[PDB]
Ligand SMILES: COc1ccc(CC(=O)O)cc1-c1cccs1
C-alpha cells in the first residue's frame with residue numbers, strides 16, 4: 343500500500359522533519375497510522391451568535407434546540423470525538439452473490455446515465471469562475487496566482503505517471519495551494535457529474551440535482567401518483583463510512599465511457615485519492631496539539647467534489663437491488679451464490695429498471711422509494727449485506743413506510759400541500775421551526791461588523807420569505823429583520839451550503855416579485871400564471887399544522903413579542919445608524 347501513499351507521507355514527514363514522531367499511543371484502530379507532527383489548535387467549542395437575528399427572536403432565547411445549535415465543537419477534541427463515534431469502523435464485505443448483483447446493476451446504471459451525455463474534463467477557467475462567484479477569499483487569490491496553476495500542472499504530471507505527491511484530505515500558502523490544487527484536479531477529472539448534471543431528474547430518473555428545495559415536494563407528490571406500496575425513506579447510519587471497496591470499484595466503471603486523456607486523469611483520482619487516501623486529523627495531547635497522518639482503502643471522503651454524485655449513484659444502485667429483493671428476483675440463496683444467474687438480473691434491469699428508477703427520489707444518501715408493493719418493507723437481506731445498515735432500528739425489523747407523501751422525510755424536510763385563497767395549490771418545504779431559527783441565529787466566524795451580521799440576518803430573513811413564508815413566526819420575524827436592516831444593504835455570506843439551495847434570497851429585489859417568479863412564473867406545477875399582488879394572498883400553513891411543526895402561535899410570550907416587535911426593530915435601527923430603512927410590519 344506504501345507504493346501509492348508513500349510519496350505523500352514522505353513529503354509531509356520531510357516538511358515537518360522538526361517535530362515528526364510515531365506516537366505509539368495513537369487512537370486509530372481501522373485506519374493505518376503513519377505519524378504525527380505539532381500544529382496550532384483550529385476551531386471553536388461554541389458558534390458565534392448573530393445579534394440581529396437573536397434580538398428579533400426573543401421567545402426562542404428560551405428554546406433547547408436553539409441553544410444546542412449555538413454549541414457545535416470544531417476543536418481537535420471535537421475532531422477526535424466525532425472520529426471515534428463513526429469513522430473508525432470496518433464494514434463487513436458483502437457476500438459473493440451481492441457483489442455480482444451490484445456489479446450488474448452498476449454497469450447497467452452507468453450506461454443508462456451516459457445514454458445522452460458523454461463525460462468530459464472540467465477546466466481551470468470553470469474552477470476559477472466558480473471560486474469568483476462564491477467570494478469577491480484566499481482561494482480567489484490562489485486562482486489569480488499563476489504559481490498555483492504551475493503546482494497543479496506538476497501534480498497532474500505525477501498523476502499521468504500513476505503517482506501522487508500532494509493530494510491529502512483534511513478532516514503556509516504551499517500547504518493551502520496543495521489542498522486547493524488537489525480539489526481542482528478532482529474537479530478536472532470528476533466535476534462533469536455535477537457541471538453537466540448527470541443526476542438531474544431528466545437524466546437520472548431518480549435524481550433531483552439542479553431541481554432546488556422548492557421542487558422536491560412536487561417531485562414527492564408526483565411519485566405518490568405511481569401505483570404501488572407505501573413510500574419508504576430509510577436513513578443509513580453514517581453512509582460515507584459504509585462505502586465499501588466493492589462500491590468504489592463499481593463507481594470507477596464510469597471511466598469506460600471517457601476519452602483516453604480524461605480516463606487517465608480520472609483513473610488517477612479513483613486509484614490514488616479514493617481507493618487509497620492520506621488523511622490529516624488534529625488531536626489534543628498533554629504536550630499540546632498534533633496532526634495525525636492516517637490512511638485507508640475504503641469509505642467516502644465527505645468534502646470531495648465527487649461525493650454527492652457518487653453517493654447518489656451507489657444509493658440508486660442499492661435501492662434498485664432492494665426493489666429486486668422485494669419482488670422476489672433476489673433470494674437469500676442468490677446473495678450467497680458466487681455463480682448466481684446473471685440473466686434474470688439483466689432481464690429485470692432491461693424491462694423494468696427505468697420504471698423502477700422513476701419510483702424514487704435520491705439525493706446522496708437520502709432516498710424515497712415507492713416499490714410495486716410492501717414486500718420491500720421486509721426486503722433487508724441485500725441492503726444490510728451491501729453495508730447500508732439503517733440508522734437506529736434492529737437490523738431485521740421491517741421498515742415503516744408512509745401512505746401520505748406529506749409525511750415523508752427527505753433532505754431534512756417534509757412537504758405540505760397548501761390551498762391559496764384563489765384556489766390554486768402550492769407544495770411547500772417545511773421542517774421543525776426551532777431548526778430554522780437556531781440556524782439563523784448562528785453567524786459564520788468572528789471579527790464580523792454589525793453590517794456583515796445584519797446582512798447575513800437579512801439573507802436568513804429573505805430565505806424564510808421565499809421558502810418558509812407559510813410559517814407565521816418566520817414571516818413575522820423575516821418582516822422584522824428586513825425592517826431593521828437598511829433596504830439597500832445586499833445580503834452577504836450564505837445561509838446554507840446545500841446543493842438544493844439556489845439562493846434567490848441573495849438580492850435587494852422585492853421579495854414578493856422574487857416569490858412570484860419562483861412559485862408562479864417559473865413553477866412547472868403552477869398551470870395558472872396569475873401573479874400574487876400582495877403577501878396577504880401568500881398563504882400560511884393551517885394553524886394546527888404550523889403548531890405541529892413548532893410554531894409558538896397561541897402562546898402569550900409570542901403574542902407579547904409580536905406586539906412589542908416595533909421596539910426591537912427600532913433598537914437595531916438605532917445601533918446601525920442613520921440609514922434608509924423600510925417598514926414591513
Ligand atoms: C434540502 O435543502 C436544505 C437542506 C438542509 C439545509 C440546512 C443547512 O444546510 O444548513 C438547508 C436546505 C435549504 C435551505 C434553502 C434552500 S435548500
Ligand SMILES: [Zn+2]
Pocket residue numbers: 497501505506507508509
Ligand atoms: Zn495527487
Ligand SMILES: [Zn+2]
Pocket residue numbers: 756758772773887891
Ligand atoms: Zn411542517
